[PDB]
C-alpha cells in the first residue's frame, strides 16, 4: 500500500525574477509598481480651487482673471497652463518662491492697508486690464501725477501688521515705454522708490524703454514682495512710477498645490497627483510620473516588478 | 530549490489539487484518493500574506512641488533639482528591483520549506512501518484503508498499531 | 519556521535551560536530567554577534549645516533643501526597516538551522540503536545510563557498543 | 529510555518585525535607532568658541558683542540664538553664504589694509555701538564730511592681498534716515560707491528714507563682501555714505559650525551635534534631529527598530 | 553553515576533486576512486552565475555635471550640491556593502543546500541497504563493485537487487 | 564497503564578508567595485570637440580662441583648464547654468539677428582681442558714440525667433574705468540697457570706476544671456555701454560635456568620464571619482567589495 506528498501547480504560471534567475514560473504573483492612472484630479473631500485663467500670483495683485479668487480658501489649489498672473505686462521678482508659499497657504485673507492720498491721482487704468472697460489690478493702485507732466509729490505711506500671522506685501515699479511717457505720467527727473521694514531695506529706480508688445503694451510693471512680521511696519517712500498696494495678503492655513491639465472630479478621492491626473494605489512604487506630489508611491524607472505570491510552478 | 523538495525529489506538482498548496495522494485497497493539507497550506499563505501586508502600505510622507512645469524655474537650481531627483530615482529603482528579487527568492525557498516540513512530519508518523521511495512517496508496508489514511492526514496514526504487521512485511 | 524545528516538530522550548540556547533532556534508569550544548549555542551566538558587529559601527561621513534655524534661508533653496532632506529620510527609513526585517527573518531561520543541525547530528550518532519519536526525542532502544547520555552529548557514543542490544529490543 | 532535543525560552520575550510577521516574540533583541540625547555640546578635545551674543558675521565687522572674537581661532564654532552681527542696524548682503564660509574657517586672522585719509573725519560713532560710550564697528571706519554739510572729496583706496590665502573684504553702505541727514553727514548730490577687484565690479548708491526704528535708530548700514584672491587688488572709489574697512579677514584652517541652545561641556567628547545637544551612539540610525551634523547615525522617521539577537521565543 | 553539510557534518572538502563542486568518493573491492557529480555542480554554478548576470549590468541612467572643477561654483549652491552628493554616496556605499554581504551569505547557504540535497538523494537511493556513518559517508552493507558505484552516481541503482544481501549483512 | 559525499576546496581561497562573518574564505570570488581607470578620454564612435583654449561660453560670443568653434557640432564636448570665455576681461553672469546648457546642446548653429545701426559707430575693438591686430568678439558689436563725447542716441532693436528650436541670446554691458571714459565713449549722463522677451524683463546699468588691470586693461565687459522661445521676440532698449549681439545661437541636438585634463583617444570606446579619463566597466560600483558623468557605475566610498562565486573553502 502507499501515500504520496505533493503540491499544487497550474498549466500557466507567472514569470518573476529572483536573486538567482530571471523569469521563473511561480503559481500566482502580483504587481508591485503602479501604472494605472486616473486621468482626473480626484478632489473628493477637499475644498478645491481650479484657478483656470487666474495665475496663482494674480490672487495677490488681482487682475480681472482673478476677481473670484482674491480671498480664495482651499485645501487643494490647481494651477492651469492658461493661467496668467498679469493683465498689464510684467513679472514677479522672486516669482517661484512666492508660488511655493501660496500653494501651501490654505488660501489668502485680505486686509486694507488704508493708504489714502492727496496731490495725485489714484486711479490709473489700462485696456489690458478690462472690467467694464479700462481698469487695473484690483488690489493695487496706479498712482499718477495730478495732470500730464505735473510733479509727483515726494510721499511716504506706512502699514503696520496689526495681525497675529505674518503678511505678504506687494508693490510694483512701473517701467514706462520711454522717458517721454515717464515724464508724462509722473513728471520729470530722477524717480526713486524706497521700501523698508525692520528686516528689509531696498531701493527701486524705474528703467524706462521699449520692449515687445504684450496685450498691445510695451511698458512693464515688475512686482516685488516681502514678508512683514507681526507688529512690524513697512514704509514706502516714493516720488512716482510706483504701483501701490491697497491690500495686504495673509495665509489661511495649509494646502497642497498642483499643476494639471485634466478635469476636477469631486466624486473620486485621492492623495497623489500629477498633471495627468490622480494615482490611487496601495502599491509601494509607481511608474506614472516622477514629479508627482502629495502622498505617493515612489517613482521607479521600471514598468513592472512582480512579487511571487505562490510557490514554483512545476507542471507536466 | 533550497530544501530540495519542490522541483527536486518531488519531480513535478499536481494541477488537480485545488483545495490547497500541499496535499496527500494515497493508493490502497479501496483505490486512489487526493486531499489537501490545511495546516501546511495556511502556514505558507499566512507567511506570503505577511510579505504582502508589509509592502502594500501607506507612505504618509507628503512631497510638494519644487519645480514648475508651466513657467520653468531658473536653469541652475532646476538642473540641481533634476540631478537630485534623478539620483533618488536611481536609488528607488535599485531598492525596488532588489526587494522583489530578494523577496521572491525567499518566497520560493519558503514554499519549498513547508513541503520538506510536511514530508518529514509524515516520515516520522510512520516510524519503522514505511520506507521512503525517493520520489515523495512512502511504501506503507501494511494494509492502510481509507480510515487509516485519514489518520495519517489528521496526525492521529499510531505506528505501534501496525508495527508488527509491517516489520514482518518488510522482509 | 524554515528548517521546521523551533516552533515546529519541537513543540515549544525550555524556560529551565539556562546555560545555553540548545540542549538535551534525557530520561533513563537514574532519572530525568537537562544539559546545554555549548558548541551549537556558541555557533548561533557568534553568528548573531557578527550581525551586531556589522551594524554597531562608525559612519565616518561628515555633514555640515546647509540650513539655518535662527535666521531662515531663502525660501526657494530652503524648499529644495527640505525636499532633498525629506527624500533621503525616506530612503534611510526604508533601508533601516528592511534591514531589520531581513536580519530578523534570517536570525530566526538561523537559530532554527542550529537546532535541526544538532537533532540530525544526534540521530546520526545513534545509527540503528534509536528511533525518532516525532517530537524532538529519540526512543533509545537500549539501556543508556548517565555516563552513556554524557557520551551522546560530548559526541563519543559508539553505536556498535549497543547495536546488538538495540537491534534485538526493536522487535 | 529517552533523549530529547530542545532549546531555550523565556516567559517574556521581545516583539520584533520580520519579512513575514509583525511583532514576533524572540528571546532577546536590541535597539538599532538612537533616541538618547546628551543635552550639552560635548566639546572635549576641540578648541571651541561659544559666540554668545556675537553673531558669527560680527566677527568680521566687530561690533562690541564681538570684541573677544575679532581674531578667534577654533575647531568648533557655536552660534547662539541671541547672537547679532550688528550694533548699528543693518544686515549683510548674501549673509548665509558668508556664515557657511566662516563656520568652516577655523577662525580668522586680521591684517590692516592701511587706509589713511585726509580731508574728512574718520571717526563717526553712535550710541547703538557702545563701548565707553558711543563707538562703532571695530574693524570699520565711519567716514564723514569734515564738518556738517561739507563736500566729501571723491576718494580712491586700494588694498592688495599680500598673503598666500584668499581674503574676506567687507564694506558698508550707510542708508541715512532722510536726504537731509545724508547731506548733513557727506554733503549734497548723488552718492556713489564703486568697488572692484579683477573678478568683481559693482556699484552702490545709498537710498535714504524713513523706516522703522531698530535700537531706536531709523538709519541702516547694510554690509557687503567679496573674496579677494592672492596678489589681487580691491579698489574702493567713493564720495561718502561709505563704511570703510580697516582690516581684511583671512581664514585659519578648518572648523565645523553648529547652532545650539545648550551648554558646552569639555568633559564629554562627541562628533554629532544638533541644537539640543550631542548624539553619542554606535547605533546605525537616530530619531533625534533630522538636521544634525558632524559624523552622525542616519536620521530615520521611526522611533524604534528592534533587531533580534535570539531565536523565536516559544513558551507554555 | 545553514543546512549543516559544508563545514558541518562533512568536516572539510577535497582539493583533488577538480571536475566539479560536489562529488563522490567510494571504496570497494577494486579500490578507492573519486568522481564529480555534474548535475548538482551545474545547479550551483547556474544559480551563482544568475547573481552575477543580475549585478554585472548596464545602468543606462545618464548623469551630467552640476558642479565645476576648474572655476568653482557659488558657495551656497555648491555646499548644497556637496551635501546632496555626499548623502547619496552614503546611500550607495550602504546599498553596496549590504548587497554583497547578503548575496554572500546566500551564496554560501546555497552551496550548502546543494550538498545536503545530494547526500539526501543518495540516502534515498540506498533505502534499507546502507547506513549513515555521520561524516558524509554511507556504510554500504553489500558488495558494490565499480559498476554498482557508477549506478549510485548516475541514479540507476536498484535497491531491491541488493536488499536481501544487505538486510542479512546488517546483523 | 563504502561511498562518501563531498565538495571541492583549494589551498588558498579568497576572504569575503557576509551578514554573519567578516573575512570568510570562499573558493572563488570577484570584485564588484571598479578601481581601474583608463587615463584618456575614450572618444571612439562619437564626434568629439576638444575645446583647448576656447572656453565653452566663448563659442557664443566668439573671442579669437573660439573662431574654430563658432558653429561647432558634437556628441562629446571637452572643456580644458586653459580655456577662457573671454578676450576683453569680463565674466558671464549666471555662467555655470549656461555651460550646463551648452554641454548638453549637441553644438550650436548661428543665425544673424540683422541689427543695423545709424548715428553711432559699430566697430569698437581692442588689443586684448587680437586677430590681425585689434579686433573684438566675432559675434558681437562694440557700439560707440560717433565721436569722443557725442550723444549715444536712445535705440531699440528687436529679434524674433523665426526658428523651431529655442535660441540663446547674448549681450554685454561695458564697465568703463571712470565716469570720464564712459562719457568719452558713449556721452554723458545715466546709461541704461533694458532687455525683454515675454518670459523675461531685466535691466542693466554700467558701473564705472577704478579696478586693477587684467591683460593691462581696467575696463570690464560682463556678458548676460536669456533663452528666447520660438515665435517670441527679444527687445534691447539702450543708450550706450552696450555690447550688442550680431548672431543668436541655436542648439543642434544632444551632447554630453566633460571637463578633463587628459588626452582624447578615438580608438578606445567608453561612456563614463571624469577629468582623469574614462571608466570602462560592467561592474555595478566604482571608487574612482565621485563626480564622474555619463553612464557610470555608482560611486561608493569603499575601495573593494568582493562577491563570493564559490562555496566556503574548507581545507585540512
Ligand atoms: C504686539 O504689540 C503689543 C504692544 O503694544 C503687545 O501687547 C503684543 O503682545 C505684541 N505681540 C506681538 C507678537 O507682536
Ligand atoms: C528637468 O526634467 C524635466 C522632465 O523630467 C525636463 O522636461 C526639464 O526641462 C529639465 N530641466 C532642466 C533645467 O534641464
Ligand atoms: C524647512 O523645514 C524646517 C524644519 O526642517 C523649518 O523649521 C523651515 O522653516 C522649512 N522650510 C521652509 C521653506 O519654510
Ligand atoms: C605674488 O607676487 C610676486 C610677484 O611680483 C611673486 O614672487 C609671488 O610668487 C606671486 N604669485 C602668486 C601666485 O600669487
Ligand atoms: C565640494 O566637493 C569637492 C570635493 O569632492 C571640493 O573640491 C569642493 O571645492 C567642495 N566645495 C565646497 C564649497 O566646500
Ligand atoms: C509660429 O507662427 C505661425 C503663425 O504666424 C504658426 O503657423 C506657427 O504654428 C507658430 N507656432 C509656433 C509654436 O512657433
UniProtKB/TrEMBL annotation, chains A, D, F:
This is Hemagglutinin. Disulfide bonds join 42-268, 54-66, 87-129, 272-296. Belongs to the influenza viruses hemagglutinin family. The gene is HA. GO terms for biological process: clathrin-dependent endocytosis of virus by host cell; fusion of virus membrane with host endosome membrane; fusion of virus membrane with host plasma membrane; viral budding from plasma membrane; virion attachment to host cell. The keyword Cell cycle does not apply. Signal peptide: none annotated. Binds to sialic acid-containing receptors on the cell surface, bringing about the attachment of the virus particle to the cell. This attachment induces virion internalization of about two third of the virus particles through clathrin-dependent endocytosis and about one third through a clathrin- and caveolin-independent pathway. Plays a major role in the determination of host range restriction and virulence. Class I viral fusion protein. It comes from Influenza A virus (A/chicken/Dongguan/536/2014(H7N9)). Glycans are attached at residues 28, 231. It is a single-pass type I membrane protein. It is found in: Host apical cell membrane; Virion membrane. GO terms for molecular function: host cell surface receptor binding. Keywords: Clathrin- and caveolin-independent endocytosis of virus by host, Clathrin-mediated endocytosis of virus by host, Disulfide bond, Fusion of virus membrane with host endosomal membrane, Fusion of virus membrane with host membrane, Glycoprotein, Hemagglutinin, Host cell membrane, Host membrane, Host-virus interaction, Lipoprotein, Membrane, Palmitate, Signal, Transmembrane, Transmembrane helix, Viral attachment to host cell, Viral envelope protein, Viral penetration into host cytoplasm, Virion, Virus endocytosis by host, Virus entry into host cell. In natural infection, inactive HA is matured into HA1 and HA2 outside the cell by one or more trypsin-like, arginine-specific endoprotease secreted by the bronchial epithelial cells. One identified protease that may be involved in this process is secreted in lungs by club cells. Palmitoylated.
UniProtKB/TrEMBL annotation, chains B, C, E:
The lineage of its organism: Viruses, Riboviria, Orthornavirae, Negarnaviricota, Polyploviricotina. Belongs to the influenza viruses hemagglutinin family. The chain holds residues 340 to 510 of 560 of the full protein. It is found in: Host apical cell membrane; Virion membrane. This is Hemagglutinin. Glycans are attached at residue 82. The gene is HA. It comes from Influenza A virus. Homotrimer of disulfide-linked HA1-HA2. It comes from the Viruses. Disulfide bonds join 144-148. Binds to sialic acid-containing receptors on the cell surface, bringing about the attachment of the virus particle to the cell. This attachment induces virion internalization either through clathrin-dependent endocytosis or through clathrin- and caveolin-independent pathway. Plays a major role in the determination of host range restriction and virulence. Class I viral fusion protein. Responsible for penetration of the virus into the cell cytoplasm by mediating the fusion of the membrane of the endocytosed virus particle with the endosomal membrane. In natural infection, inactive HA is matured into HA1 and HA2 outside the cell by one or more trypsin-like, arginine-specific endoprotease secreted by the bronchial epithelial cells. One identified protease that may be involved in this process is secreted in lungs by club cells.
Amino acid at each position: 500500500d502507499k501515500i504520496c506528498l505533493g503540491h499544487h501547480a497550474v498549466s500557466n504560471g507567472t514569470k518573476v525574477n529572483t536573486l538567482t534567475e530571471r523569469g521563473v514560473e511561480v503559481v500566482n504573483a502580483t504587481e508591485t509598481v503602479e501604472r494605472t492612472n486616473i486621468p482626473r484630479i480626484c478632489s473628493k473631500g477637499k475644498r478645491t480651487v481650479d484657478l483656470g485663467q487666474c495665475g496663482l500670483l494674480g490672487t495677490i495683485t488681482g487682475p480681472p482673471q482673478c476677481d473670484q479668487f482674491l480671498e480664495f480658501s482651499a485645501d487643494l489649489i490647481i494651477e492651469r497652463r492658461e493661467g496668467s498672473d498679469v493683465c498689464y505686462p510684467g513679472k514677479f521678482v522672486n516669482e517661484e518662491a512666492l508660488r511655493q508659499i501660496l500653494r501651501k497657504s490654505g488660501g489668502i485673507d485680505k486686509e486694507a492697508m488704508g493708504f489714502t492720498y492727496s496731490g495725485i491721482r489714484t486711479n490709473g487704468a489700462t485696456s489690458a486690464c478690462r472690467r467694464s472697460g479700462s481698469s487695473f489690478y484690483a488690489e493695487m493702485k496706479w498712482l499718477l501725477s495730478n495732470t500730464d507732466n505735473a510733479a509727483f509729490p515726494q510721499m511716504t505711506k506706512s502699514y503696520k501688521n496689526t495681525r497675529k500671522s505674518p503678511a505678504i506685501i506687494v508693490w510694483g515699479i512701473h517701467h514706462s515705454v520711454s522717458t517721454a511717457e515717464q515724464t508724462k505720467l509722473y513728471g520729470s527727473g530722477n524717480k526713486l522708490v524706497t521700501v523698508g521694514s525692520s528686516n528689509y531695506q531696498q531701493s527701486f529706480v524705474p528703467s524706462p524703454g521699449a520692449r515687445p508688445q504684450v496685450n498691445g503694451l510695451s511698458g512693464r510693471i515688475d512686482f516685488h514682495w516681502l514678508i512683514l512680521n507681526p507688529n512690524d511696519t513697512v514704509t514706502f517712500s516714493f516720488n512716482g512710477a510706483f504701483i501701490a498696494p491697497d491690500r495686504a495678503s495673509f495665509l489661511r492655513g495649509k494646502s497642497m498645490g498642483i499643476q494639471s491639465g485634466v478635469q476636477v472630479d469631486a466624486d473620486c478621492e485621492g492623495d497623489c497627483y500629477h498633471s495627468g491626473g490622480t494615482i490611487i494605489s496601495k502599491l509601494p512604487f509607481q511608474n506614472i510620473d516622477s514629479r508627482a506630489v502629495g502622498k505617493c508611491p515612489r517613482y521607479v524607472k521600471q514598468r513592472s516588478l512582480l512579487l511571487a505570491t505562490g510557490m514554483k510552478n512545476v507542471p507536466e | 530549490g533550497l530544501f530540495g523538495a519542490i522541483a527536486g525529489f518531488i519531480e513535478n506538482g499536481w494541477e488537480g489539487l485545488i483545495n490547497g498548496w500541499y496535499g496527500f495522494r494515497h493508493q490502497n485497497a479501496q483505490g486512489e484518493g487526493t486531499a489537501a493539507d490545511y495546516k501546511s497550506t495556511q502556514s505558507a499563505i499566512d507567511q506570503i500574506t505577511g510579505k504582502l501586508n508589509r509592502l502594500i502600505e501607506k507612505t504618509n510622507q507628503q512631497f510638494e512641488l519644487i519645480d514648475n512645469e508651466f513657467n520653468e524655474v531658473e536653469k541652475q537650481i532646476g538642473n540641481v533639482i533634476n540631478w537630485t531627483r534623478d539620483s533618488i530615482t536611481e536609488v528607488w529603482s535599485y531598492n525596488a528591483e532588489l526587494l522583489v528579487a530578494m523577496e521572491n527568492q525567499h518566497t520560493i525557498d519558503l514554499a519549498d520549506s513547508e513541503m520538506d516540513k510536511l514530508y518529514e512530519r509524515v516520515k516520522r508518523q510512520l516510524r519503522e512501518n514505511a520506507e521512503e521511495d525517493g520520489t515523495g512517496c512512502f511504501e506503507i508496508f501494511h494494509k492502510c484503508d481509507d480510515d487509516c489514511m485519514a489518520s495519517i492526514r489528521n496526525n492521529t496514526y499510531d505506528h505501534s498499531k501496525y508495527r508488527e504487521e509491517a516489520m514482518q512485511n518488510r522482509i
